[PDB]
C-alpha cells in the first residue's frame, strides 16, 4: 500500500477556508432540505493552481454529487483591521457560501476571475453558470430577495480612496499612519469606508437602491448561539458578563419572562445551537473532555433543562445545518480530511455523505495516538503523536514538532506548512502540538487585549508553552519513543514566535524551521509602521523599546545571534521577508547555520500549490539532513546539499 507523500498531501482536496470551526459557513442546504451545496478546492502543484468546483449533493445519499460550476481564482479572505479598510490578506481563502434561490433551482455565490470578485449564478442540476453581477468594486456579499432579484454589497468608496492616493502620490506621500512597510510602500486606505447596497432584477438587468428592509435581510446574520422553540428563546450568557473567561451557560426565556439558567455542566460553553419546533427540542454542540479535546452534540427536550449527550468524538464538526432530524456537517479528524457527513439527531449516528478525497486506508497510514498530560503549571494539555507506519516498539526515533492546533485532520499544522504524515512516512516521530490554555485565561479579564498584556508580561505565557513542549518531549523520552538529542521544531504565526523563543531560551532543539522571522523591535515596531506599532503596545508587545531593551532580549535574533547554534531554515513569503533581514544578517555574520528562502507573491499563510509542495519537500529534506544525517541523491538537490554541508562545517 503506497505511502502518503508530499505529492499526495498537497493534492488532498478541501471544503471551505483552511481553518474551519463550528460556525464556518461552508455549506448551504436547499430550502426544502433535500440538497446541500458547497465549494471544493483542489490544489495542483504542476500547474500551480487551485481548481475550484461548486458542488450540489442530495442529502439522502442516493445520487452522485454534481459539479454545477468549475473555475475561479483563489479568493482571499480580507477584512478591515487596525483602522485600515483592508488589512493585508492572511493568505487564507474566503469560505464561499452558496445562496439558494427560494425555488431551490439556482445558486448565487461570489467568485473571482481576472482579479475581480463577481456574483455568479448557477443552475442546480448542472447546466451551467455565468456571472450576473460585476461592478468597479469587488462584490462582498449577496442574497436572493426572490427568484429573480438579488441584493448585493461592496465598497466603491475603497476604489475612490485608492484613486485619491494615486493622485496624491504625484506630490509625494508623508510617511505616517497609512503605511505598513513590511507589505508595501504605498499608503493604505483608512476607515471609515461605507458599504453600498444595490438590487439587481435579473429579468430586466436593471439596478435600483435597496430599501432598509432589504438591506437588513443582507446585513443581519443569524446568531448561532440563539434559538427559538415555541415561545422559548434560548441563549447563552455569563454570571459576570464582563469577565470573558467566565463560562457561559444556556438560558431559557418564555416570551418576556425571567431567564432561567440551566445548572448542568453540559450547558457550559456551547459553541452552536439549533431549535426544532416539530420535535420540541434544542440541539447543541460544545467542546469537552481533557483539555477540551473532544466535540459533543447534545439533545435537550425544550420543556425542561436536561440535556442528553448523543454523540462525541475527537475531530471537528463544521458548518452544520439541520434538515428535520439530521444535521448535515463538514467533519474531519486525525486521519480523515474534511468531508461531509450526516448526523442522526435521535441515535447520534454519523454517516458519510460526500468525501472529495478517496479513502485514505488505500495508503499505508501512520499510527496516531492522542497524548494527554497536565503540565507543570497545572494545565491540561493534549497533543497527537504520529509514528511511522513500520514503527516497531524499542526503536528510538528523531522527533519533529508541528504546531499549534491538532483538532482536525493532520495536514500541515497551522498554516499548512509542515507536512505531518509525510514526515512520519520519512521515519520521524511527529508531535502535532495543540497549544494549551494560558494561566491568564483562567483569571478575570474584561478584554482579550488586556489578557494578552498579562500573557506577554515577562513572556509568562511563552514560558508556559515552552515548558509544555519540554514536558511532552520528556514524556516521549521516558517511553523510549524518541531520542531527545534529535528534536526538530517548526512554527508558523504564533508557533513562529515559539520557535524564536525556544531557540534562545533552551538547548532542547537540534534543528528548526519557521515560516517567518523575527520577533524583534525591527519587525514589530519599524516594519509595521506607526499605526500598528502603536496599537500593539496595548497587547503587551513593547514596540516603544528598541531592540536592546529588556522585552526583546528573550526573542531577538539580532541581540542573541552569537549564541544561536541551532540550524534554522526560514521559508518566508516575500511579503514578510524584510522582517527577517536584520536577524538573518546578524546570524550570518556570527557564522551560524541559518538559511532563508523567499517565495514570490505570497502571504503570511501560503496559497500557491507549487510553493506549498516545495516548502513540504525542503522541510523534510532539512530534518533528514540534520536529524538523520541523510540526503536525497537526486541531482536537482545537489546544490542544496552543498549549501547545507557548508552550513554544517561552520559549526567547527
Amino acid at each position: 500500500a503506497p505511502p502518503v507523500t508530499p505529492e499526495v498531501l498537497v493534492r488532498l482536496a478541501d471544503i471551505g477556508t483552511m481553518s474551519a470551526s463550528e460556525t464556518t459557513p461552508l455549506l448551504s442546504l436547499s430550502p426544502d432540505g433535500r440538497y446541500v451545496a458547497f465549494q471544493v478546492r483542489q490544489a495542483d502543484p504542476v500547474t500551480n493552481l487551485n481548481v475550484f468546483r461548486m458542488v450540489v449533493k442530495a442529502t439522502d445519499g442516493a445520487t452522485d454529487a454534481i459539479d454545477v460550476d468549475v473555475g475561479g481564482e483563489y479568493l482571499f479572505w480580507t477584512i478591515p483591521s487596525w483602522g485600515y479598510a483592508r488589512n493585508a490578506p492572511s493568505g487564507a481563502n474566503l469560505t464561499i457560501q452558496p445562496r439558494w434561490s427560494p425555488s431551490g433551482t439556482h445558486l448565487a455565490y461570489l467568485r473571482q476571475d481576472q482579479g475581480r470578485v463577481r456574483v455568479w449564478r448557477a443552475s442546480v442540476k448542472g447546466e451551467g453558470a455565468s456571472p450576473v453581477i460585476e461592478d468597479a468594486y469587488d462584490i462582498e456579499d449577496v442574497q436572493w430577495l426572490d427568484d429573480n432579484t438579488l441584493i448585493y454589497s461592496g465598497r466603491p468608496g475603497f476604489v475612490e480612496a485608492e484613486a485619491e492616493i494615486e493622485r496624491e502620490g504625484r506630490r509625494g506621500w508623508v510617511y505616517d499612519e497609512r503605511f505598513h512597510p513590511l507589505t508595501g510602500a504605498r499608503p493604505r486606505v483608512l476607515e471609515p469606508i461605507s458599504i453600498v447596497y444595490q438590487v439587481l432584477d435579473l429579468k430586466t438587468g436593471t439596478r435600483r437602491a435597496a430599501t432598509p428592509t432589504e438591506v437588513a435581510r443582507l446585513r443581519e446574520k443569524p446568531d448561532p448561539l440563539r434559538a427559538m422553540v415555541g415561545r422559548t428563546t434560548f441563549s447563552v450568557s455569563r454570571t459576570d458578563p464582563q469577565n470573558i473567561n467566565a463560562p457561559t451557560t444556556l438560558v431559557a426565556r418564555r416570551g418576556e419572562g425571567e431567564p432561567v439558567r440551566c445548572d448542568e455542566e453540559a450547558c457550559q460553553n456551547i459553541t452552536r445551537m439549533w431549535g426544532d419546533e416539530t420535535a420540541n427540542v434544542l440541539y447543541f454542540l460544545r467542546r469537552e473532555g481533557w483539555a477540551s479535546n473532544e466535540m459533543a452534540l447534545y439533545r435537550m427536550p425544550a420543556d425542561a433543562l436536561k440535556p442528553v449527550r448523543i454523540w462525541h468524538a475527537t475531530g471537528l464538526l463544521q458548518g452544520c445545518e439541520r434538515q428535520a432530524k439530521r444535521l448535515i456537517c463538514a467533519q474531519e479528524s486525525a486521519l480523515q480530511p474534511r468531508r461531509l457527513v450526516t448526523l442522526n439527531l435521535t441515535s447520534g449516528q454519523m454517516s458519510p455523505l460526500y468525501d472529495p478525497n478517496p479513502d485514505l486506508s488505500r495508503y499505508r497510514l501512520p499510527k496516531v495516538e492522542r497524548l494527554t498530560l497536565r503540565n507543570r503549571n497545572g494545565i491540561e494539555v493534549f497533543s497527537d503523536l504520529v509514528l511511522p507506519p513500520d514503527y516497531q516498539l524499542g526503536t528510538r526515533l528523531p522527533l519533529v514538532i508541528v504546531q499549534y492546533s491538532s483538532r482536525g485532520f493532520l495536514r500541515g499544522g497551522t498554516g499548512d506548512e509542515n507536512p505531518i504524515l509525510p514526515l512520519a512516512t520519512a521515519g520521524f516521530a511527529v508531535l502535532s502540538f495543540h497549544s494549551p490554555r494560558s494561566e491568564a485565561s483562567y483569571q478575570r479579564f474584561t478584554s482579550p487585549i488586556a489578557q494578552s498584556k498579562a500573557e506577554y508580561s515577562n513572556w509568562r505565557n511563552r514560558w508556559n508553552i515552552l515548558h509544555t513542549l519540554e514536558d511532552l518531549i520528556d514524556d516521549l523520552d521516558r517511553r523510549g519513543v524518541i531520542d531527545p538529542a534529535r528534536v526538530g521544531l517548526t512554527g508558523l504565526a504564533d508557533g513562529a514566535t515559539t520557535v524564536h523563543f525556544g531557540l534562545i531560551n533552551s538547548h532542547r532543539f537540534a534543528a528548526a524551521v519557521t515560516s517567518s522571522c523575527c520577533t524583534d523591535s525591527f519587525t514589530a515596531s519599524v516594519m509595521n509602521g506607526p499605526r500598528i506599532s502603536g496599537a500593539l503596545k496595548a497587547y503587551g508587545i513593547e514596540t516603544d523599546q528598541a531592540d536592546d531593551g529588556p522585552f526583546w532580549a528573550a526573542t531577538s535574533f539580532v541581540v542573541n545571534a552569537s549564541r544561536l547554534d541551532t540550524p534554522l531554515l526560514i521559508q518566508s513569503a516575500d511579503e514578510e521577508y524584510l522582517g527577517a533581514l536584520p536577524g538573518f544578517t546578524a546570524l550570518q555574520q556570527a557564522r551560524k547555520p541559518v538559511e532563508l528562502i523567499i517565495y514570490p507573491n505570497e502571504h503570511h499563510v501560503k496559497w500557491q500549490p507549487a510553493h506549498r509542495l516545495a516548502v513540504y519537500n525542503r522541510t523534510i529534506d532539512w530534518f533528514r539532513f540534520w536529524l538523520m544525517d541523510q540526503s536525497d541523491p537526486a541531482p536537482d538537490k545537489a546544490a542544496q546539499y552543498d549549501r547545507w554541508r557548508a552550513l554544517r562545517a561552520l559549526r567547527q
Binding site: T17, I79, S81, A88, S90, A92, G415, A493, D494, N528
Partner: peptide
C-alpha cells in the same frame, strides 16, 4: 494565523483564532 478573529498571529499585524 489563517483565520482573522481574536488575538495576535505573530507580531506583524495578523490576527488569530
Amino acid at each position: 494565523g489563517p483565520t482573522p478573529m481574536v488575538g495576535l498571529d505573530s507580531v506583524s499585524g495578523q490576527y488569530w483564532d
